[PDB]
Amino acid sequence: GKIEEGKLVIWINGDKGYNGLAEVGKKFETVEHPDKLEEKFPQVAATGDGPDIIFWAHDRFGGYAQSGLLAEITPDKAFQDKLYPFTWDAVRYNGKLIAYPIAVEALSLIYNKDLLPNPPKTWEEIPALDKELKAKGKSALMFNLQEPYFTWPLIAADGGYAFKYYDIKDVGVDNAGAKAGLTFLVDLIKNKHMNADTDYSIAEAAFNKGETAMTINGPWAWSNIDTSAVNYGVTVLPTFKGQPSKPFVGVLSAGINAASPNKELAKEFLENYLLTDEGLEAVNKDKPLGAVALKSYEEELAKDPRIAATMENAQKGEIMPNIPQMSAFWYAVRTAVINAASGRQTVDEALKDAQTGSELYRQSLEIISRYLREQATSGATSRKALETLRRVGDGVQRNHETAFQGMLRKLDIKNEDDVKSLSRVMIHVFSDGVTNWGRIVTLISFGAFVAKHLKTINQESCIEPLAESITDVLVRTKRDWLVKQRGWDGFVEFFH
Amino acid sequence: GKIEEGKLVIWINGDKGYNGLAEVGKKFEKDTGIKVTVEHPDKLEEKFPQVAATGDGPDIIFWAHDRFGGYAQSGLLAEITPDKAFQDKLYPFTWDAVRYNGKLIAYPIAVEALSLIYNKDLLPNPPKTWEEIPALDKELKAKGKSALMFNLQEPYFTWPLIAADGGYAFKYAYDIKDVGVDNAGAKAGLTFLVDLIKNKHMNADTDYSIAEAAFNKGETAMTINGPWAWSNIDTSAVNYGVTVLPTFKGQPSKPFVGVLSAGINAASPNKELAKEFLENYLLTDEGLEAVNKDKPLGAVALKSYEEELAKDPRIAATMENAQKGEIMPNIPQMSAFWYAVRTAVINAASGRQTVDEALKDAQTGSELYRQSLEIISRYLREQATSGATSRKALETLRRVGDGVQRNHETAFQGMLRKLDINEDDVKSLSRVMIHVFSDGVTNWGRIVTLISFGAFVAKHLKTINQESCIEPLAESITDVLVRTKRDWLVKQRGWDGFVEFFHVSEHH
Amino acid sequence: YLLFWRDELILLX
Ligand SMILES: OC[C@H]1O[C@H](O[C@H]2[C@H](O)[C@@H](O)[C@@H](O[C@H]3[C@H](O)[C@@H](O)[C@@H](O[C@H]4[C@H](O)[C@@H](O)[C@@H](O[C@H]5[C@H](O)[C@@H](O)[C@@H](O)O[C@@H]5CO)O[C@@H]4CO)O[C@@H]3CO)O[C@@H]2CO)[C@H](O)[C@@H](O)[C@@H]1O
Ligand SMILES: OC[C@H]1O[C@H](O[C@H]2[C@H](O)[C@@H](O)[C@@H](O[C@H]3[C@H](O)[C@@H](O)[C@@H](O[C@H]4[C@H](O)[C@@H](O)[C@@H](O)O[C@@H]4CO)O[C@@H]3CO)O[C@@H]2CO)[C@H](O)[C@@H](O)[C@@H]1O
């Protein structure tokens, strides 16, 4: 076969210095900036197609490596000594280096020095500042409310985390600290100090055309403000309830497709061409990377007050997990923020369902997989749910034996793909029209019935894939209903 | 199934004035006390037919009239029963749009058409022709601007240009046999679009968001959009005009005319409450004004509030482009036409397919329903009791299908017993076929076996004196076939591939 | 539902 040989296809997000990266390509001798590339890559790579090299923040790469879609990178100790150790820890999954670290990225408060000589140190004083600036036909603050990357600093301030160092069970999205953060944001919008529909384009336009006094953005944005020649400062993010704003720290990382026949050529480009003072200078000259992983060119650019303040906000923030569940966390919180910002959900309802969303897949898999292996041969919720599944599911099996045996004799399993096919069929059979806990338990109870048959028929290895596949179609087709029922906690309350 | 009683759940597309429609909901809850839930789900036009068939879904579904034909065919819409007074309150052209098989299946709201939206400050005098836009882009590019940006990702926006020199979905007589997607006028239209993109006057990847952004940020001089978009430009503080779409080869642009329609779920126990809301609360001057104030509907079906708003130069130009365009068919396979053409446009815009290859496969996709139904239905009626491809396919279906029935008789009898078919009410559960390709695999063996069992059941229908319910069974099999496997079918050279698959097995 | 399991049409209950 699918992927081109004797050529390198590179995917980097359009907000990064792709034209700089293509100049490095020119020296070496295809750089593309596709939309939704972080969603496309895992899809195409699994069918053996996709780019040779994928550029994204380190947070996405854990999911990719889990799915086997990334080549194990093989650097010289010389090369590893050329980059910061903290950048390698970011790019490490299951004790394997899964991509090449480029640069450390963090949101900072960007302010118009002319409009705002001394920007506010606190979030709490911005509504008063907006009143003052509104009289001059201006605004205090405009940033991207459509992405949870920009909204999270404020949420994480008084209490908020994605994980505990990572404990995939311990997620901090339903906290009273997160409630306060998001309630502050929603108040700014209700008081018309900000607008729910503000995105990256609208905020960048306003700041660069001088209409707003402050924006929240990363190093990539400096080039377009540099063109605007608005006198701009880069500084610490405002404190909320005296606690610092905690932005997620991203590491721009370059990974290689496990399906690329040019894995050698890829290593060369990244090691001997890109991660060189000369090489990083090309990309940074187009769009600034921030504090590059290469210690040498970092030493050169350290002097920049802009980078100094990017690193200042990083110390106060937390590095992103690369675990595979980060994606679900992001999707869930994105919706929480937007639904609260719009008033479609209250902050409590919105944050509650985002907590459920983040944990749903991991929890589902844990519960279902344990039940299936146990029958053959989030922890508190899991324990109680598995306890419930044991009593109820052994009951559904007993009462549905005749129907379950008929179906088993029809749907005989040979491989991982027949196990996958079984899943797609089961959701349809058992969930005729309606989603209710009875039907979901009946589906899992049939999964158990088949897992028992797999042991009988000496295919014990097919159990984990079955559990994976059932979890997949369960969360995919009933995500909203499950989150609406407070997930597995609702399951335990239904059967008490 | 699970539709709740004593409340109304409404689905309307997010590009429409849902917050205005929810304000009408607030008034209704003030008066009748009945709780009104207005939601804007993504892909709601695809969700509704799925959920409604299983007896769930919203009380009221809002979409353009083109989707409602498919819904009514599947029995998912309540037949609306208005006073002649009420019908006389709305425009006759709006009712004809909503009418399927001589039944009114939804309430017409407003008439929609794409117009040329232009920045008055950047472009005081917008171009009258498509052919002069490349020269205009050269001029505007020097100022770091662009002439034209619109949604290339949706065939609604690309179609005006395609239909200009020669292009139709299905010819009115609607002749579902006569489809005009691969003709030389469509080729010229789409070749003009692909030339703009190759000459870097436009970009393949431009969508609704990117085009709206550019126009409202002042970066492009023109966009193509409908009334719904005016509110977001109104906020942008760009001096904007609404005008006639550019002419192509001296022929005017023919945009598809959509009628925002409100339909009621056949499975709603609040059918009474629904009628009240739409007739006496929406589709009243005060009511339409609420929705229009959020997002403009265009020229509303209600003659009274149309008379009020007729003055708008914007609406005048919307109706001007409508006279030049043609109203969308509501026949059920509009869906397949849309999906097919969407891919044609995107593949040509990207260069994945040439215009000829792209339009050719979209012609095959659109024509597949009619031809599939013809072949399948003939076989089924033949078994119970014109076209070159059809004749050979039916010849093949006779030999192979009569064979599959003969060899699988005992298994086929077992399944017929389990379906318990002994009357017409028992026949009306044909959500059996919905999931035939659940494991995700498609081959001609499977498709013949499915049709061969369709024949087996059609023979039982004659036995059970239900001769009339043969065509519905044939229609259901055709539905799942073309709905789920259109691309595979087109990729296999359609029914001609079917005849060659079984020609080969026979002779070798 | 009528279903295909490996080139075999099946009524699955
Ligand atoms: O149809 C409705 C809806 O759809 C559209 O939104 C989708 C986006 O197009 C799509 O890209 C998707 O994005 C996800 C992403 O897939 C996921 O990885 C996560 O994104 C994280 C990054 O992982 C993380 O690095 C950080 O990204 C930074 C990056 O580090 C930084 O270097 C720089 O590039 O800024 C980025 C921030 O934008 O944070 C983000 C999270 O904020 O989560 C994303 C979702 O937030 O998500 C959408 C799928 O729903 C339309 O855009 C939308 O308007 C429509 O309503
Ligand atoms: O993966 C497939 C992609 O396509 C899916 O959308 C389909 C719809 O389900 C079809 O209905 C059809 O859409 C037509 C539509 O029926 C027609 O009325 C018109 O819709 C206009 C509408 O009148 C107007 O009010 C406004 O909203 O503009 C609409 C166009 O955006 O035109 C549609 C054709 O463009 O075909 C579409 C796709 O073409 C699915 O929703 C996609 O999300 C998906 O990516």
Side-chain angles (χ1 to χ4, degrees), chain B residues 80-127 129-270:
Chain B
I80 73 141
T81 46
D83 256 333
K84 290 159 202 189
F86 192 78
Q87 294 174 240
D88 294 335
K89 288 215 270 145
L90 311 195
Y91 284 113
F93 50 85
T94 69
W95 290 111
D96 309 338
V98 122
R99 203 169 302 117
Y100 188 67
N101 291 357
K103 314 139 179 267
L104 297 182
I105 62 190
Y107 283 97
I109 318 298
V111 178
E112 312 168 355
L114 297 181
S115 302
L116 184 64
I117 307 171
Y118 69 99
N119 192 317
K120 297 232 216 78
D121 300 312
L122 267 179
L123 206 57
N125 295 296
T129 82
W130 277 100
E131 299 94 336
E132 62 195 83
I133 291 186
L136 192 56
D137 193 64
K138 295 172 193 319
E139 295 181 67
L140 279 160
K141 276 278 167 66
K143 329 218 225 306
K145 304 302 185 86
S146 61
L148 180 63
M149 277 178 96
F150 63 103
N151 190 0
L152 309 185
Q153 302 315 295
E154 281 296 287
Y156 183 64
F157 298 84
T158 310
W159 189 256
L161 179 54
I162 277 165
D165 193 55
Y168 51 98
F170 310 93
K171 239 355 174 184
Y172 186 87
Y174 288 98
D175 208 79
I176 43 259
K177 312 110 247 281
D178 200 16
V179 176
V181 176
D182 86 323
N183 89 91
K187 292 253 180 88
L190 186 51
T191 301
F192 198 75
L193 191 104
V194 171
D195 283 350
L196 289 167
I197 297 158
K198 270 187 304 219
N199 292 331
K200 295 290 175 90
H201 301 317
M202 300 205 303
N203 162 52
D205 304 311
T206 310
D207 62 6
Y208 192 102
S209 290
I210 286 179
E212 202 183 31
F215 190 74
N216 293 10
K217 267 150 55 232
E219 298 185 340
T220 193
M222 293 177 293
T223 194
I224 300 173
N225 230 318
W228 51 88
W230 297 340
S231 285
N232 316 295
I233 322 177
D234 278 321
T235 220
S236 88
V238 149
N239 192 20
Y240 81 87
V242 172
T243 192
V244 57
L245 282 159
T247 65
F248 184 55
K249 291 168 94 194
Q251 316 215 279
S253 266
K254 304 196 179 294
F256 261 144
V257 182
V259 180
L260 185 57
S261 301
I264 306 131
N265 203 330
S268 174
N270 313 296

Side-chain angles (χ1 to χ4, degrees), chain B residues 13 15-16 42 45-46 63-64 66-67 112 151 154-157 228 258 328 335 338-339 342:
Chain B
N13 205 33
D15 67 337
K16 305 294 143 40
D42 198 53
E45 76 285 342
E46 283 169 320
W63 201 258
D66 70 297
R67 265 301 195 155
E112 312 168 355
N151 190 0
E154 281 296 287
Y156 183 64
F157 298 84
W228 51 88
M328 302 196 230
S335 216
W338 278 131
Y339 284 122
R342 186 188 189 270

